[PDB]
Amino acid sequence: KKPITIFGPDFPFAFDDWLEHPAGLGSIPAARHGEEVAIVGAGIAGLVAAYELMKLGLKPVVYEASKMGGRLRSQAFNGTDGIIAELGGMRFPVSSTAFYHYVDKLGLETKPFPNPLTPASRSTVIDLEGQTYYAEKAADLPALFQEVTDAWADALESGARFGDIQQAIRDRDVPRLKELWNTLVPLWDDRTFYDFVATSKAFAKLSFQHREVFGQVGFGTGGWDSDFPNSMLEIFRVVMTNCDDHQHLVVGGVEQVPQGIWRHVPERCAHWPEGTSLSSLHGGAPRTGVKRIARASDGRLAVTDNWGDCRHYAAVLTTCQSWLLTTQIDCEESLFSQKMWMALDRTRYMQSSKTFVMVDRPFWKDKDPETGRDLMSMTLTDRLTRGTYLFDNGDDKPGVICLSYAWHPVEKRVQLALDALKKIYPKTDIAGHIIGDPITISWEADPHFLGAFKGALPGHYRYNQRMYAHFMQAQMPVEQRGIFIAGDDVSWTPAWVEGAVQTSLNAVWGIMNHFGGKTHADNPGPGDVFDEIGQIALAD
Amino acid sequence: KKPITIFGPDFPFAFDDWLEHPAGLGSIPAARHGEEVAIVGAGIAGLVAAYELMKLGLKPVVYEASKMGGRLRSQAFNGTDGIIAELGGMRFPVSSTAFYHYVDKLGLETKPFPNPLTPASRSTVIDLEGQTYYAEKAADLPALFQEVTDAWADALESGARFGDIQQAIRDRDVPRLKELWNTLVPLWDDRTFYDFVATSKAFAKLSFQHREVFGQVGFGTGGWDSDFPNSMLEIFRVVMTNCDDHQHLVVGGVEQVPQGIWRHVPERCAHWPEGTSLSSLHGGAPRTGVKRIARASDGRLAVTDNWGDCRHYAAVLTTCQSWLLTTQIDCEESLFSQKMWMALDRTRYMQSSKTFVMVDRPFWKDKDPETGRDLMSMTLTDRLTRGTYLFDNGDDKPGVICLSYAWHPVEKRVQLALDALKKIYPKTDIAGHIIGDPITISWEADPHFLGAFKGALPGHYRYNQRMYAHFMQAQMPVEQRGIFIAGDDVSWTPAWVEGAVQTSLNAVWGIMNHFGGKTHADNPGPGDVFDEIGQIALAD
Amino acid sequence: KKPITIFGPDFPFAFDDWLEHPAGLGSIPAARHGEEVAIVGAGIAGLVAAYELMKLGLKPVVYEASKMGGRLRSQAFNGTDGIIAELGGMRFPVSSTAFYHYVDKLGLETKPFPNPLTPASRSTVIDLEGQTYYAEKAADLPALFQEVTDAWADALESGARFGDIQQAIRDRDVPRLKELWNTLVPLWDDRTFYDFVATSKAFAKLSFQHREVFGQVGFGTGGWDSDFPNSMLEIFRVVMTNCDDHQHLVVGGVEQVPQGIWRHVPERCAHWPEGTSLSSLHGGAPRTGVKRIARASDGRLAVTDNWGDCRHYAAVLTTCQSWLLTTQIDCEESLFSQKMWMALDRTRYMQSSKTFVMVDRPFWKDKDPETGRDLMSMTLTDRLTRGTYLFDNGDDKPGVICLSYAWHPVEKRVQLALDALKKIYPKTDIAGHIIGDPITISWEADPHFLGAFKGALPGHYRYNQRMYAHFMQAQMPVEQRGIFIAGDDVSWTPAWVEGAVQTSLNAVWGIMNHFGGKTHADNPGPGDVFDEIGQIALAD
Ligand SMILES: Cc1cc2nc3c(=O)[nH]c(=O)nc-3n(C[C@H](O)[C@H](O)[C@H](O)COP(=O)(O)OP(=O)(O)OC[C@H]3O[C@@H](n4cnc5c(N)ncnc54)[C@H](O)[C@@H]3O)c2cc1C
Numbered sequence A, B, C: 001k002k003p004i005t006i007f008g009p010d011f012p013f014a015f016d017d018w019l020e021h022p023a024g025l026g027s028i029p030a031a032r033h034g035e036e037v038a039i040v041g042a043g044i045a046g047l048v049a050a051y052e053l054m055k056l057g058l059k060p061v062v063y064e065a066s067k068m069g070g071r072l073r074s075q076a077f078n079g080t081d082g083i084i085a086e087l088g089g090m091r092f093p094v095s096s097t098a099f100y101h102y103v104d105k106l107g108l109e110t111k112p113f114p115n116p117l118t119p120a121s122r123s124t125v126i127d128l129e130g131q132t133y134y135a136e137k138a139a140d141l142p143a144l145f146q147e148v149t150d151a152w153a154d155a156l157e158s159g160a161r162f163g164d165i166q167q168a169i170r171d172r173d174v175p176r177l178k179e180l181w182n183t184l185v186p187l188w189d190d191r192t193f194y195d196f197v198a199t200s201k202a203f204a205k206l207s208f209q210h211r212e213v214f215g216q217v218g219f220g221t222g223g224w225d226s227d228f229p230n231s232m233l234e235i236f237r238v239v240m241t242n243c244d245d246h247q248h249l250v251v252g253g254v255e256q257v258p259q260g261i262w263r264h265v266p267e268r269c270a271h272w273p274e275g276t277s278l279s280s281l282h283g284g285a286p287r288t289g290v291k292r293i294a295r296a297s298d299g300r301l302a303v304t305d306n307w308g309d310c311r312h313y314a315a316v317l318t319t320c321q322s323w324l325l326t327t328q329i330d331c332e333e334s335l336f337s338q339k340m341w342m343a344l345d346r347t348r349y350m351q352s353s354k355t356f357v358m359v360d361r362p363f364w365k366d367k368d369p370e371t372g373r374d375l376m377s378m379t380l381t382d383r384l385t386r387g388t389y390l391f392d393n394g395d396d397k398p399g400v401i402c403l404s405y406a407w408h409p410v411e412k413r414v415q416l417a418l419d420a421l422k423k424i425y426p427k428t429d430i431a432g433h434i435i436g437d438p439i440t441i442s443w444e445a446d447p448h449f450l451g452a453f454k455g456a457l458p459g460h461y462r463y464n465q466r467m468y469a470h471f472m473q474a475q476m477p478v479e480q481r482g483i484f485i486a487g488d489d490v491s492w493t494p495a496w497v498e499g500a501v502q503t504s505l506n507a508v509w510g511i512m513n514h515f516g517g518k519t520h521a522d523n524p525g526p527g528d529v530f531d532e533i534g535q536i537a538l539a540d
């Protein structure tokens, strides 16, 4: 079978084909080469856009208020050479084909993520209501977990035509894909993942306890409870495009992606001398934080940094979490329509915490001979810690444990997790193996950021659709043209890096178009097919 | 008309009748008079329980980790006599008849709260997507508001038999109320208020805008969007018992209720000398914060305070937000069943902010000669402030403005609200009337609180039901008897003080029962009718 | 002997006589009655000035950014009626005759403070280097303490003519006082209290251990180590005017002083209707925080509050800690001479912490029969706590303990003190007696404040002298006249409330003078004698 990819459903454009075609993304009239475009944010969406716009012969000017890379952030443990904790995104589904274009272009290595019940994990432990279940494969788990898995598979088949949608994604059958998906949009926009579960016949036939299990740990590979309040459409998108499985980690830390894009010399650029990179063009560093964006009296856009320095541009792309545009960035009211402002004000963000320790070796691989069990496993629980992941860097290098994912000082956070993990594994001495420093993150603190990523709110498809289409500007008044937005808040998969890359590439098409440029006839880009296969607009 | 009171629907017991009966609440055998019972928390739930158990001849020992009153908290502005800002609860629906029992006992005065479109408010302004609507009566508003109003009424009437339930409430007809309510519980437990509105016929045939207005400002009396994620059963309870209307403020500040209960000499009391109050029994102050609760080897409960002092009690009642029992307070595992632990672990809390200024006089009552509009009104908006309240203390006295009630230093909070109000009232100089200090509160920022109050989660009716029933301990193993819980998270109306009072009175019943007491035959209490009319248990 | 008072040495003006004389402080021409004078700060210096200027027929307009009373701040423990912890100043030497004028005028009660080795304290314990010394009177202490006391008495006699200065203060012999003091000013301005100790023959003849004792606990009544880095002149002033002994507490909390001044009706006011008070004149509350002071184009002074409200005044008195004028308050550069700005920029502040608990009764009064010792005493130590004070509110009301004075959360601060006090008193159970809530303060946090009070820096007499004389404005250019400063940073006794009151009364004379007013011939005020007996100016 042809692979599942993040191909629609909302906009089934082949971003991958577009990036891979030998013709390139398009061209800008040479009279405009060298002109500047401001890009606010040096996370993956800002840098992908800057890189491709550099290749088209413009001079991107990246601004960054905090650290290069944004929410792709990898921290080395003290003393070590490349043993990292992932502070932002860490598990990248292979269906993320536009993201992996850049990973592959940089020649970075990836490996399978140690998810429960996969080849990359030896064993799993589920701890619920004080009972522990050990499993080396899914069939080791008690029947109740398979019942949960069947009820979920049946709910998605009955409720959303999961099988048909996946096949149309595999085949890239756009007409069929849009027919299946567009039926679901007005049905499920207004309804939570809570409501999908509670009105599905398959979950209704199971005991309450089964629905609880499903929220805490799913069928044994990860719970759903943090997603229950969100729009069911968001959950459909996730599961239909395999975001939630077949995931890889980037060896040496995914921060190498935006750091490598910064430094990478394209083989072929319009206008620039051979050897040019984003880094070259900038004299080595992005500009500082943006505090104001305004329309200048010459009709160009005015961008003022934190220190009062104000520079003019024909186009500005903002990739900070989009709610900062309403408060933090003083962005001139005439720059967005009233309805765009309303969509921008309404975004809400989910919060997350992860704490990592380093260990001297992957001791979890040892066997307890009184039981046959690994000393420790990928752990899913209803307790504090929720999920614990084990990273085997090889038998004779340090391991890393993500002691706690979930949705006090570092020292207290780690002690609380080790106490909970002692309840679950009363015979294993985890503490004894820990070395170096603990690394903790909460995205909340710092800001600059509002949360790990947005939670798609029921009833907000209309706002999402207006923001997603913002790059299509032929019909907008001249006072609203020339500013562009991208990043994972803009995208249909807000928790997943491929959303940030796809919306970024839509913005690249938009900006190219803005400068009088166009795609090559044999390699059309997002704005060439958007009106025909773009996301449906709902009435009112 | 017989009034609507907070009489069920889940537990339709007349707590008001039980308090007002001249027989009193019951009695405990003389041999047990003077024995101590620990009460953790000196909010309204802890003090009402302490008060009534003192009357029955016990020696309550109240512990308080922060301030007396809990979330009933009233702060005076600098240098004034009796001019207050209400930091916790401020508007108390007169359906709250058990709370008002204590307000009245203490001879406190109340007045109508200045809610929009009521006689206590002269005018309202609604400000939505950049447009302003002035109204001195509901009919001044454009037709969109009356359509939302009719839709909500039709939705409740159609989907929940609201008219019939309210009539059963007014009549105190228990069999009819339970028949109407019990049918709703399994239908709506696991659906959100989002889902209820979206799927209702009456909103489903109106434009998107109508639902959006409903979320932001309702039909002109306050928006509902902060309750959208909650179980629809919670919202039924609130509207069916009139929690959201006919509200009064306590003159001089609602904190006088718990401070007064503390000092009040009861009109009858077993065991204690004439003139005894909670305050005299305690020698003036509650004990400090509790750190640990455990079962001692003599079979009693051991309560260890923050400074390590340990004391034994035959019963302990806890009234802090009940999730603290899982974390801040080290509460011995064997004290709750596994199922009670699971209910306790699951509660989640809503967050709140309010900022108040004092003004020199009630200037908003001045007319603008031009437009005929008040200078300022009760203001509902989609802007940051969300709601602004105006408190008239008489023409010759300072006024108070609640500048923002929504769901940062104080100076930046006030400045940002004044900037939003300038956008709405570009001709009114609010700033020029402000005197004294700005008073703000965020409940989350204090560590003895997790939020303003819980939000009821879809699907948690089974947990709610088990925690509400925990005071009924005939069927429990010995090791789980003698500890009790009460407070607003325990109740069916978790954002309303009447829930804290009613759950506290169930606990009083349970504690009197624990000490071998009982109610008088002519005044039965909650535990005497619970098994028959208490809330329905759902099956697995 | 006639009593020691805070009478000079630097400006030996009888503030007390001036306040007490039946003529009053002076008068302003009636044509200026009712005109406004801005006063920034509602601590004791702002309110004393406002009160007296109201009496002269002006309309003071008090501004307050934080809480009325400033660093006189008394907090009731929860549940109690008037059992207070003192958060600011708590021990007021009776030599503070201008401060006590207001205490007496308000009819507040005072009582002796429980200082070590005084009639108000039963016993003292000194704990040093792990040895404990118990004493009910000074002679119980080992010889080493009397040796320290003699060496200090001899150092002050030899080095500073302590005896002669005290006699000239008792007699109020101004010529002699100024002759003795003015010799010391240039000698000791540049030298620390460190240096005075290390070059004195009396300390040189003692072992090192004796000098250490002196810094930690003095001769048994309080150590000096926190004062060692300061200008020796400041220490002279303190000891010569008995600031450091014969101290009283204000019953019910010293915050009653500025709160009572706010509400007090003078018997005799110029201009105002009978019954006028500061509170009346203000409609009940001071204005909010000041953010800007500027010179207006009409020549008057412009005062802008935090909310942008800007009002004009003929005169402004600022009493916030004076360093806020340089940063926080945007105060126009033309308002102060260059040399005044320099004096204002150079002030530095000392930091302090105090933690208080309430206890059920004054248990410390109980005797240990195995030893004859009180269970607990006023405790001086080199450990964390430094000093612990015991407040006996009567055998049958709660006691208060100041567990820790010295120069983490509250819970941790109290635990750390109880642990240290367990080392010292291994047999006493303090914890068991503690009730209510702990009250802690650090002045640092909040700001508004820079520290508890300024530390007089060696070599800064010239800056102190210019700021002290700032109220004398006949010789200043018209652009620098009309603004005035007062408060304890301005005063010669920065750690002591009488400094704030004296500089305030100098400002009252200044402002009166500014409005064309004068003192009565038979009751001359500070500015009438300042040029003749004011603080010496040093050359350069
Ligand atoms: C906890 C967590 C786990 C995740 N897990 C995964 C995962 O498993 N798989 C996956 O695919 N994805 C995951 N993601 C998502 C992926 O990390 C994001 O989708 C992606 O990194 C966001 O990229 P971006 O360019 O949209 O935004 P960002 O990375 O946020 O970049 C925006 C940049 O703008 C900067 N900025 C903000 N304000 C200003 C200003 N005023 N001026 C200048 N610059 C400014 C910010 O500092 C930031 O660097 C995860 C994210 C988080 C937080």
Ligand SMILES: Cc1cc2nc3c(=O)[nH]c(=O)nc-3n(C[C@H](O)[C@H](O)[C@H](O)COP(=O)(O)OP(=O)(O)OC[C@H]3O[C@@H](n4cnc5c(N)ncnc54)[C@H](O)[C@@H]3O)c2cc1C
Pocket (backbone or CB within 6 Å): B040, B041, B042, B043, B044, B045, B046, B063, B064, B065, B066, B067, B068, B069, B070, B071, B072, B087, B088, B089, B090, B091, B092, B093, B288, B289, B290, B291, B319, B320, B321, B324, B328, B329, B352, B443, B448, B449, B451, B452, B453, B486, B487, B488, B489, B494, B495, B496, B497, B498, B500
């Ligand atoms: C922002 C806000 C607005 C509100 N609006 C309204 C309204 O309009 N109408 C209405 O009817 N109700 C309103 N309420 C609700 C009402 O205020 C609360 O329901 C009621 O006050 C809760 O009382 P309680 O006794 O349950 O809990 P609390 O008042 O929280 O009392 C519990 C006490 O336990 C103490 N404590 C915590 N931990 C410990 C420990 N370890 N040891 C000892 N003590 C401890 C806490 O300090 C607290 O004082 C509002 C509440 C808030 C926060």
Ligand SMILES: Cc1cc2nc3c(=O)[nH]c(=O)nc-3n(C[C@H](O)[C@H](O)[C@H](O)COP(=O)(O)OP(=O)(O)OC[C@H]3O[C@@H](n4cnc5c(N)ncnc54)[C@H](O)[C@@H]3O)c2cc1C
Pocket (backbone or CB within 6 Å): C040, C041, C042, C043, C044, C045, C046, C063, C064, C065, C066, C067, C068, C069, C070, C071, C072, C087, C088, C089, C090, C091, C092, C093, C288, C289, C290, C291, C319, C320, C321, C324, C328, C329, C352, C443, C448, C449, C451, C452, C453, C486, C487, C488, C489, C494, C495, C496, C497, C498, C499, C500
């Ligand atoms: C820890 C401690 C212990 C002490 N011990 C003693 C003692 O034992 N004996 C003794 O005699 N004295 C003692 N003192 C000193 C006495 O408390 C002070 O000398 C006196 O209270 C200071 O009075 P003030 O009016 O100069 O200043 P404050 O009391 O500081 O009043 C200044 C006011 O200005 C306000 N303000 C600041 N900025 C602004 C603005 N922008 N706009 C408007 N208002 C503003 C502040 O909020 C404050 O209320 C002690 C002080 C401290 C801190």
